[PDB]
Design an enzyme around this catalytic site. Structure first.
Site, mmCIF file in Angstrom:
data_model
loop_
_atom_site.group_PDB
_atom_site.id
_atom_site.type_symbol
_atom_site.label_atom_id
_atom_site.label_comp_id
_atom_site.label_asym_id
_atom_site.label_seq_id
_atom_site.Cartn_x
_atom_site.Cartn_y
_atom_site.Cartn_z
ATOM 1 N N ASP A 274 -0.688 24.647 -14.999
ATOM 2 C CA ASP A 274 -0.700 24.748 -13.526
ATOM 3 C C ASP A 274 -1.596 23.662 -12.908
ATOM 4 O OD1 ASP A 274 -0.755 25.557 -10.943
ATOM 5 O OD2 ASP A 274 -1.307 27.628 -11.345
ATOM 6 N N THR A 275 -0.991 22.529 -12.555
ATOM 7 C CA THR A 275 -1.780 21.419 -11.972
ATOM 8 C C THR A 275 -2.318 21.770 -10.608
ATOM 9 O OG1 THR A 275 0.208 20.348 -11.065
ATOM 10 C CG2 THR A 275 -0.482 19.668 -13.254
ATOM 11 N N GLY A 276 -1.770 22.762 -9.914
ATOM 12 C CA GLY A 276 -2.292 23.193 -8.624
ATOM 13 C C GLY A 276 -3.370 24.226 -8.679
HETATM 14 C C1 LIG Z 1 2.621 28.369 -3.819
HETATM 15 C C2 LIG Z 1 3.483 29.528 -4.422
HETATM 16 C C3 LIG Z 1 4.988 29.157 -4.426
HETATM 17 C C4 LIG Z 1 3.178 30.809 -3.635
HETATM 18 N N1 LIG Z 1 3.145 29.695 -5.855
HETATM 19 C C5 LIG Z 1 1.912 30.075 -6.307
HETATM 20 O O1 LIG Z 1 0.955 30.248 -5.571
HETATM 21 C C6 LIG Z 1 1.913 30.245 -7.827
HETATM 22 C C7 LIG Z 1 1.933 31.772 -8.036
HETATM 23 C C8 LIG Z 1 1.850 32.098 -9.542
HETATM 24 C C9 LIG Z 1 1.764 33.639 -9.793
HETATM 25 C C10 LIG Z 1 0.475 34.237 -9.171
HETATM 26 C C11 LIG Z 1 -0.699 33.587 -9.912
HETATM 27 C C12 LIG Z 1 -0.688 32.081 -9.573
HETATM 28 C C13 LIG Z 1 0.602 31.397 -10.083
HETATM 29 C C14 LIG Z 1 0.621 29.930 -9.809
HETATM 30 N N2 LIG Z 1 0.636 29.708 -8.324
HETATM 31 C C15 LIG Z 1 0.533 28.281 -8.102
HETATM 32 C C16 LIG Z 1 -0.883 27.771 -8.144
HETATM 33 O O2 LIG Z 1 -0.876 26.422 -8.590
HETATM 34 C C17 LIG Z 1 -1.694 27.998 -6.839
HETATM 35 C C18 LIG Z 1 -1.203 27.058 -5.746
HETATM 36 C C19 LIG Z 1 -2.143 27.001 -4.554
HETATM 37 C C20 LIG Z 1 -3.063 25.985 -4.479
HETATM 38 C C21 LIG Z 1 -4.006 25.884 -3.453
HETATM 39 C C22 LIG Z 1 -3.999 26.881 -2.446
HETATM 40 C C23 LIG Z 1 -3.093 27.907 -2.496
HETATM 41 C C24 LIG Z 1 -2.131 27.983 -3.570
HETATM 42 N N3 LIG Z 1 -3.097 27.811 -7.144
HETATM 43 C C25 LIG Z 1 -3.978 28.813 -7.020
HETATM 44 O O3 LIG Z 1 -3.666 29.948 -6.647
HETATM 45 C C26 LIG Z 1 -5.398 28.447 -7.376
HETATM 46 C C27 LIG Z 1 -6.029 29.568 -8.168
HETATM 47 C C28 LIG Z 1 -7.380 29.037 -8.602
HETATM 48 N N4 LIG Z 1 -8.485 29.523 -7.999
HETATM 49 O O4 LIG Z 1 -7.457 28.187 -9.481
HETATM 50 N N5 LIG Z 1 -6.110 28.058 -6.118
HETATM 51 C C29 LIG Z 1 -6.785 26.891 -5.978
HETATM 52 O O5 LIG Z 1 -6.956 26.126 -6.939
HETATM 53 C C30 LIG Z 1 -7.261 26.676 -4.574
HETATM 54 C C31 LIG Z 1 -7.478 25.393 -4.129
HETATM 55 C C32 LIG Z 1 -7.920 25.177 -2.825
HETATM 56 C C33 LIG Z 1 -8.157 26.285 -1.933
HETATM 57 C C34 LIG Z 1 -8.599 26.190 -0.613
HETATM 58 C C35 LIG Z 1 -8.798 27.343 0.169
HETATM 59 C C36 LIG Z 1 -8.549 28.626 -0.375
HETATM 60 C C37 LIG Z 1 -8.109 28.723 -1.686
HETATM 61 C C38 LIG Z 1 -7.902 27.593 -2.491
HETATM 62 N N6 LIG Z 1 -7.469 27.746 -3.775
#
Ligand SMILES: CC(C)(C)NC(=O)[C@@H]1C[C@@H]2CCCC[C@@H]2CN1C[C@@H](O)[C@H](Cc1ccccc1)NC(=O)[C@H](CC(N)=O)NC(=O)c1ccc2ccccc2n1
Ligand SMILES: [Cl-]
Ligand SMILES: [Cl-]
Ligand code: NA
Lengths: 99, 99
Positions: B25-27
């Site tokens: 998960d690069t995000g």
């Molecule tokens: C965007 C969407 C289509 C909803 N997909 C997802 O969100 C899927 C859902 C999957 C099942 C649930 C568990 C997570 C996975 C992977 N995620 C992708 C995943 O890559 C997701 C994308 C993202 C990035 C930044 C901000 C919001 C959302 N990252 C995350 O959820 C990670 C979790 C972490 N603390 O490492 N968040 C962050 O790294 C992150 C970065 C900056 C921020 C700024 C403000 C508030 C929150 C912030 N969170």
């Protein structure tokens, strides 16, 4: 390019004529952008992230440039702290993960 | 390996003596695993993403094997619906995004 992951993989996108910063996200199925105006009709979608489910607006067949690469596809619009480029568009620009 | 993004980039990991499936998960800034026991000290943390925040336990200096590649770093444990390998460990296995 070859993008390492020591910092967030942020790039410039162009959508609706405007430049925005977005995160290249292999963990996201879909592309989600902060509130903006897009043309045409939208459809409902519920997406699930790490903190729960949220309602977004689904726009299909939207022109978007990602780090200079052209794509045309589905964009979800809703409240997010970060614009996210998910696999639907990463595959259009030919992105892979390599190790 | 080269991993395409037509499908979710799921790999096998070994953590705490257990085999699990996890998303590359690069995000994600952090690595987040579903509830399990890990040895040593921990401290509470709130992490966020789409949908809001979740409370997790932060374990430092945890060894993990990701698709055959050993790494060490911080692992967060809590109620995530999907195990995620975030950038803190992707860097250690030399993962890059290429297009
Ligand atoms: C965007 C969407 C289509 C909803 N997909 C997802 O969100 C899927 C859902 C999957 C099942 C649930 C568990 C997570 C996975 C992977 N995620 C992708 C995943 O890559 C997701 C994308 C993202 C990035 C930044 C901000 C919001 C959302 N990252 C995350 O959820 C990670 C979790 C972490 N603390 O490492 N968040 C962050 O790294 C992150 C970065 C900056 C921020 C700024 C403000 C508030 C929150 C912030 N969170
Ligand atoms: Cl770490
Ligand atoms: Cl490197
Ligand atoms: Na520890």
């Amino acid at each position: 390019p070859q993008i390492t992951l020591w910092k967030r993989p942020l790039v410039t996108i162009k959508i609706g004529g405007q430049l925005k910063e977005a995160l290249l996200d292999t963990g996201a199925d879909d592309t989600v952008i902060e509130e903006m105006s897009l043309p045409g009709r939208w459809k409902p979608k519920m997406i699930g992230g790490i903190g729960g489910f949220v309602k977004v607006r689904q726009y299909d067949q939207i022109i978007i440039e990602i780090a200079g690469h052209k794509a045309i596809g589905t964009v979800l619009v809703g409240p997010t702290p970060v614009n996210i480029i998910g696999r639907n568009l990463l595959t259009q620009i030919g992105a892979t993960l390599n190790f």
